[PDB]
Subunit: 216 residues, 3 copies
């Protein structure tokens, strides 16, 4: 039913203890990063948040992060999900700690929710109370500060973003207009933590409203 | 059966009477445009034509217009369809008039047609007799002049475009090679109205030919 | 079962004996190329290899080559497959010879293989012993030299590329990170022919390993 959590899952994972020199150059890895952890999951935004959480729980940084066209439900294989994260580290131990943190946060952390009882529409309104290096890489987001991670289908997202910015003391840090590779739209809002929560609640109310009466 | 109209439908709609300042800046809205109408439908090109028709029937202009990867049949939700149009206006009344025009033209206007009796292949060959601001935004298209809107799968489209340019007194204004986000290919042809109709008929004949015997 | 060949098929084909002048200009065709062969198939990489083989078997060159978003299984129509190749030639005879070579190599040539018995995961590890103009267009690849064509889902591909570069005397010529329009990842490796075969075998072993135990 509406507001129930969609539980994402890790679909594939591997650790490259020592990345090949040639491939390392093509990947433009810093000198210190010669160990690489690969992970794929069926939910892109939840995974992006987990990767960022990983850069707080270990000596890792995101080397690569991209989502798939049309999402997991139209993926080329079960191992693909709709994302691939490559975490880089100085050694296999740090990489595994990072990956462990990613697994924990993909299975029991930030999660999309059903916008309706029909369960054909999904959205994400999540507060990252303390951003790590990854999310703070984005222009407008400072390392350690909080943020609201808002994701929804094109129209729900546009309406909801406007509705969030009017509900709390927050600023638009990054706006990803529709479509993303997955055909969703996304926004990263900044400000106080309590304010970000507020924004998330207003976002949710907007998406649910459209879910109930999509055409007024 | 072949040549039957595919009837598209509006999947979601909303009006933002007064857009948030911050969001307005990120959207780069002109000073006069502070009211915003959002609409999503299951057919991208038909919707693009409706939006353009709207800029003739009201004091609106298209702020944003983009289609989804792999189309409506592989959309993330029923409200997404495969397009989102954001119409901008000076006030909610103009925006609603624009949206009303969009609805009318999405339900009873330009429409794709089945290329075969199997109904697994679709195309669009439509004459926009008088283009509005939106379509005329495209390089080569003058405000008010006519044009042929041709859309078909990669090969059908390439063959048909060539076939249209040989059938009537027309020029290639814009060519969108495959794939578009929806995996179709498209062309906007220019010239006299009667000539555009001619181009549409030759386009159709080419697509049907391939539909009957795809491999000669 | 695992390692069985996926047999691709041509989905649509046509020859334009004499391309329209206007369209020819928009396509930026060289003066000598005024005949054009169009072909679409359900497998993009196999088709890219066939097109390249065609530039060896006839006086043709690839005018256009692009794949579709989310692949054949989520294509807009059966004629679309997931690729469109436009071969350009000086006359219809050369174009038809090129197309004949493309058909033969799409039906009985380079072919993806199932990574698992479930047959939900596919990969490509193929040695092009003598590259033609098309593949050698890519920076790092010399006309006539050999190469390994490696393709797999995001994680399988990353792991396998690293694994290939460690298995044989080869260099990374081109790396296409995930996702491609089809949501796969790809690599073109260079070096001796025997070495390329080696790389293909190590690639395959890596993809199969992940297929058996995707999460270690």
């Amino acid at each position: 039913p509406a507001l129930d959590l969609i539980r994402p899952s890790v679909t594939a994972m591997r650790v490259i203890a020592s990345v090949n020199a040639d491939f390392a150059r093509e990947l433009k890895l810093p000198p210190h990063i010669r160990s690489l952890g690969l992970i794929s999951a069926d939910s892109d935004d939840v995974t992006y948040i987990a990767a960022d959480e990983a850069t707080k729980q270990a000596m890792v940084e995101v080397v690569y992060g991209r989502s798939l066209y049309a999402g997991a439900a139209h993926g080329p294989s079960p191992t693909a999900g709709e994302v691939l994260i490559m975490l880089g580290g100085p050694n296999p131990a740090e990489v595994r700690a990072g990956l462990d943190a990613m697994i924990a946060h993909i299975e029991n952390g930030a999660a999309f929710q059903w916008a309706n009882d029909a369960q054909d529409t999904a959205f994400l309104a999540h507060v990252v109370s303390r951003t790590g290096s990854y999310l703070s890489s984005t222009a407008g987001i400072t390392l350690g500060d909080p943020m609201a991670y808002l994701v929804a289908p094109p129209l729900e997202a546009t309406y909801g973003i406007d509705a969030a910015l009017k509900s709390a003391d927050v600023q638009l840090a990054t706006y990803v207009p529709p479509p993303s590779e997955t055909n969703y739209s996304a926004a990263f809002l900044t400000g106080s933590q309590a304010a970000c929560k507020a924004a998330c609640n207003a976002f949710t109310d907007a998406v649910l409203e459209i879910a109930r009466n999509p055409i007024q």
